[model samples]
Target chain A: LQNMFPDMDPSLIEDVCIAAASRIGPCVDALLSLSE
Target chain B: MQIFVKTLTGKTITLEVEPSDTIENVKAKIQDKEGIPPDQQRLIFAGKQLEDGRTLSDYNIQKESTLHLVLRL
Candidate 1:
């Protein structure tokens, strides 16, 4: 079977996830604090 | 912040932008880099179509967000 998105890199996905969590985590905490 | 734009073919374009930037601005950047006209670009994030008038933060997009880029037929 032909693979769709054949160029997607697993490592890239992992890297983006880590970066997103690190950067956005702080903002998420602040938002939570505001709601509490 | 940096974000990822993933095309249907799985090619990724890394972009630098801020949360306050509008979707239209992002589209313009993409057009500059990839030559895909803004009018034909459709950006999707968190399973929702990103409106051109809305800022990235309005859609809750954070740094390193992976946005899907679909082209018009």
Candidate 2:
């Protein structure tokens, strides 16, 4: 898989999701909060 | 006010919403035009999540503010 898309390093997946969880999670929550 | 959005796909759309309109309202318009649901939309502006239920002006989202949307997994 790494050879298929060398630019998409597998290790960076964690970094990306970490950004989602740590930085991006609550922002989505803020939007979803409107339904509450 | 008129605002612009650039999708992760690099397509852009412009829409009009009142300053009194909820940012959430703008989200709906985006969903309608872009086919990405509000729930699936992770809107970023000025390096922060552009949250819902607040007036566009409350965020000081004045004329020409652009939002970059990253769709969720």
Candidate 3:
């Protein structure tokens, strides 16, 4: 959020989202798999 | 409605999210929390297409819903 974090780089923001999504994807998959 | 983070390194992290928030919002928050950029990220769930900017209500995200996050180096 550029509006929220004025000092944070917009490109860094993109990286953070990628990193976060990549890390969390598997955990969710595991949970969903268990439900199946 | 819960957000969980698992970090692999200083520049890498993941986010496990519930259905209460939109995929976009979750992505944004994850970036905010983990200090990663959004352009390098993508969201996937159960082999289905998880579009950005859409809320859980747009899909069949159950109370027991869980989403994974896979980050790179």
Please list the residue runs of candidate 3 whose C-alpha ends up more than 4 Å from where it truly belongs after superposition.
A1-36, B3-20
What is the lDDT of every predicted structure here?
0.74, 0.71, 0.58
lDDT, model 2, position B22: 82
Best by DockQ: 3
CA displacement after TM-score superposition, residue B30 of candidate 3 (Å) = 0.4
Q: Which residue pairs does candidate 1 place in steric collision?
A: none
True contacts kept of each: 0.00, 0.00, 0.22
Evaluated on CA atoms against the true complex, candidate 2 attains a DockQ of 0.06
lDDT of model 3 at residue A5?
78
- Give Cα distance to truth, residue A13, candidate 1, Å: 26
- What does candidate 1's lDDT look like per residue over B1-73, in tens digits? 9999986455898999999999999999988876667997778677566789999999999999899776543
Error of 1 at B26 (Å): 0.2
* Candidates 1 and 3, the one with greater TM-score: 1
TM-score of chain A of 2: 0.39
**Against the true structure, whose lDDT is highest?**
1
DockQ of each: 0.03, 0.06, 0.15
